[PDB]
Write a protein that holds these residues in place. Structure first.
Motif, PDB file in Angstrom:
ATOM      1  N   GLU A   1       0.829  -1.337   0.329  1.00  0.00           N
ATOM      2  CA  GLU A   1      -0.203   0.317  -0.173  1.00  0.00           C
ATOM      3  C   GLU A   1       0.678   1.101  -0.236  1.00  0.00           C
ATOM      4  O   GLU A   1       0.285   2.432  -0.910  1.00  0.00           O
ATOM      5  CB  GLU A   1      -0.807   0.020   1.638  1.00  0.00           C
ATOM      6  CG  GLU A   1      -2.243   0.940   0.802  1.00  0.00           C
ATOM      7  CD  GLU A   1      -1.766   2.504   1.728  1.00  0.00           C
ATOM      8  OE1 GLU A   1      -1.426   2.571   2.093  1.00  0.00           O
ATOM      9  OE2 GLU A   1      -2.761   3.275   1.323  1.00  0.00           O
ATOM     10  N   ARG A   2       1.966   1.654   0.581  1.00  0.00           N
ATOM     11  CA  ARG A   2       2.865   2.296   0.868  1.00  0.00           C
ATOM     12  C   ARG A   2       3.834   1.823  -0.386  1.00  0.00           C
ATOM     13  O   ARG A   2       4.167   2.733  -0.576  1.00  0.00           O
ATOM     14  CB  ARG A   2       3.666   2.530   2.133  1.00  0.00           C
ATOM     15  CG  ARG A   2       4.508   1.619   2.205  1.00  0.00           C
ATOM     16  CD  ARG A   2       5.029   2.151   4.442  1.00  0.00           C
ATOM     17  NE  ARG A   2       5.519   2.822   4.332  1.00  0.00           N
ATOM     18  CZ  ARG A   2       6.619   3.103   3.785  1.00  0.00           C
ATOM     19  NH1 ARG A   2       7.251   2.186   3.071  1.00  0.00           N
ATOM     20  NH2 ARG A   2       6.733   4.773   4.020  1.00  0.00           N
TER      21      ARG A   2
ATOM     22  N   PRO B   1       0.718   6.542  -6.326  1.00  0.00           N
ATOM     23  CA  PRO B   1      -1.205   6.734  -5.371  1.00  0.00           C
ATOM     24  C   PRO B   1      -2.005   7.280  -6.491  1.00  0.00           C
ATOM     25  O   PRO B   1      -3.332   6.647  -6.547  1.00  0.00           O
ATOM     26  CB  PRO B   1      -0.531   8.889  -4.990  1.00  0.00           C
ATOM     27  CG  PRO B   1       0.130   9.059  -6.303  1.00  0.00           C
ATOM     28  CD  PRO B   1       1.387   7.777  -6.032  1.00  0.00           C
ATOM     29  N   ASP B   2      -1.898   7.248  -7.799  1.00  0.00           N
ATOM     30  CA  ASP B   2      -3.005   7.167  -9.108  1.00  0.00           C
ATOM     31  C   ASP B   2      -3.393   6.154  -9.034  1.00  0.00           C
ATOM     32  O   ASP B   2      -5.004   6.025  -9.286  1.00  0.00           O
ATOM     33  CB  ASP B   2      -2.520   7.921  -9.869  1.00  0.00           C
ATOM     34  CG  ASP B   2      -0.882   7.348  -9.961  1.00  0.00           C
ATOM     35  OD1 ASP B   2      -0.535   7.697 -11.861  1.00  0.00           O
ATOM     36  OD2 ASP B   2      -1.066   5.647  -9.904  1.00  0.00           O
TER      37      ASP B   2
ATOM     38  N   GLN C   1      -5.574   4.924  -6.349  1.00  0.00           N
ATOM     39  CA  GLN C   1      -7.253   6.299  -6.892  1.00  0.00           C
ATOM     40  C   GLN C   1      -8.213   5.121  -8.064  1.00  0.00           C
ATOM     41  O   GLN C   1      -8.947   5.264  -7.491  1.00  0.00           O
ATOM     42  CB  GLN C   1      -6.719   7.567  -6.868  1.00  0.00           C
ATOM     43  CG  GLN C   1      -8.518   8.030  -7.019  1.00  0.00           C
ATOM     44  CD  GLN C   1      -7.365  10.015  -7.771  1.00  0.00           C
ATOM     45  OE1 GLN C   1      -6.768   9.787  -8.060  1.00  0.00           O
ATOM     46  NE2 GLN C   1      -7.907  10.364  -7.270  1.00  0.00           N
TER      47      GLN C   1
ATOM     48  N   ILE D   1       5.155  11.324   1.520  1.00  0.00           N
ATOM     49  CA  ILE D   1       3.968  10.133   1.069  1.00  0.00           C
ATOM     50  C   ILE D   1       2.329  10.546   1.013  1.00  0.00           C
ATOM     51  O   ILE D   1       1.756  10.692   0.506  1.00  0.00           O
ATOM     52  CB  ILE D   1       4.409   9.396   1.732  1.00  0.00           C
ATOM     53  CG1 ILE D   1       4.222   8.209   3.121  1.00  0.00           C
ATOM     54  CG2 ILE D   1       5.804   8.556   0.681  1.00  0.00           C
ATOM     55  CD1 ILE D   1       4.074   7.020   2.544  1.00  0.00           C
TER      56      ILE D   1
ATOM     57  N   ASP E   1       1.574  14.288  -1.294  1.00  0.00           N
ATOM     58  CA  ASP E   1       1.140  13.815  -2.410  1.00  0.00           C
ATOM     59  C   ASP E   1       0.087  13.294  -2.853  1.00  0.00           C
ATOM     60  O   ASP E   1      -0.490  13.586  -3.340  1.00  0.00           O
ATOM     61  CB  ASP E   1       2.580  12.382  -3.211  1.00  0.00           C
ATOM     62  CG  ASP E   1       2.211  12.481  -5.059  1.00  0.00           C
ATOM     63  OD1 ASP E   1       2.093  13.481  -5.416  1.00  0.00           O
ATOM     64  OD2 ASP E   1       3.349  10.922  -4.774  1.00  0.00           O
ATOM     65  N   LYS E   2      -0.329  11.997  -1.544  1.00  0.00           N
ATOM     66  CA  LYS E   2      -1.581  11.027  -1.782  1.00  0.00           C
ATOM     67  C   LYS E   2      -2.277  12.406  -2.031  1.00  0.00           C
ATOM     68  O   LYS E   2      -4.013  12.123  -3.000  1.00  0.00           O
ATOM     69  CB  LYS E   2      -2.167   9.999  -1.166  1.00  0.00           C
ATOM     70  CG  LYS E   2      -0.775   8.713  -1.188  1.00  0.00           C
ATOM     71  CD  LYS E   2      -1.118   7.992  -0.154  1.00  0.00           C
ATOM     72  CE  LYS E   2      -0.265   8.109   0.404  1.00  0.00           C
ATOM     73  NZ  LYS E   2      -0.356   6.652   2.177  1.00  0.00           N
TER      74      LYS E   2
ATOM     75  N   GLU F   1      -3.150  14.739  -4.948  1.00  0.00           N
ATOM     76  CA  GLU F   1      -3.487  14.091  -6.479  1.00  0.00           C
ATOM     77  C   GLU F   1      -5.778  13.513  -5.899  1.00  0.00           C
ATOM     78  O   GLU F   1      -6.547  13.752  -7.082  1.00  0.00           O
ATOM     79  CB  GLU F   1      -3.145  13.091  -6.737  1.00  0.00           C
ATOM     80  CG  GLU F   1      -3.803  11.710  -5.890  1.00  0.00           C
ATOM     81  CD  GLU F   1      -3.190   9.877  -5.872  1.00  0.00           C
ATOM     82  OE1 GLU F   1      -3.041  10.130  -7.438  1.00  0.00           O
ATOM     83  OE2 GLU F   1      -3.181   9.434  -5.970  1.00  0.00           O
TER      84      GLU F   1
END
Lengths: 54, 50
Positions: A9-10, A14-15, A18, B42, B45-46, B49
Motif C-alpha cells: 500500500e505504501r 498514488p494514482d 485512486q 507520501i 502527495d496522495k 491528487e
C-alpha cells in the motif's frame, strides 16, 4: 504494522491506488454478470462461434 | 596532593557512567525523526491528487 498488506500500500503509486478505489466503486464485472439477457446472449455468441470453429 | 587527586577519582568514574546512557538516548531520537518525515511526504502527495 508489519504485514505485506501494509507494505504494498505504501509501495503503491498514488494514482494507481485512486484508480483502484474508483473502479472498486464502479463494479463493472459484477453488473455484467448479474444482468441476465446480455450474459446469456454472449454465452450464445461464444458457444455457436465455437460450434462454427469445430 | 596525592589524597585529593585520589578522592576526586570516584566522582569522574561515576558520572562518566552517567554520561554514557544519555548518548544512546539522543541517538534514539535522531533515529525517530526520519521516518516521520517520509510518512509526511507520501501523505502530502496522495492528498494532492485527491
Amino acid at each position: 504494522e508489519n504485514n505485506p498488506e501494509y507494505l504494498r500500500e505504501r509501495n503503491m503509486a498514488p494514482d494507481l491506488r485512486q484508480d483502484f478505489n474508483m473502479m472498486e466503486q464502479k463494479k463493472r464485472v459484477s453488473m455484467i454478470l448479474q444482468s441476465p439477457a446480455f450474459c446469456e446472449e454472449l454465452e450464445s455468441m461464444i458457444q455457436e462461434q465455437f460450434k462454427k470453429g469445430k | 596532593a596525592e589524597s585529593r587527586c585520589r578522592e576526586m577519582d570516584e566522582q569522574i568514574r561515576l558520572m562518566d557512567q552517567n554520561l554514557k546512557c544519555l548518548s544512546a538516548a539522543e541517538e534514539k531520537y535522531s533515529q525517530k525523526e526520519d521516518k516521520y518525515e517520509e510518512e509526511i511526504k507520501i501523505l502530502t502527495d496522495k492528498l494532492k491528487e485527491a
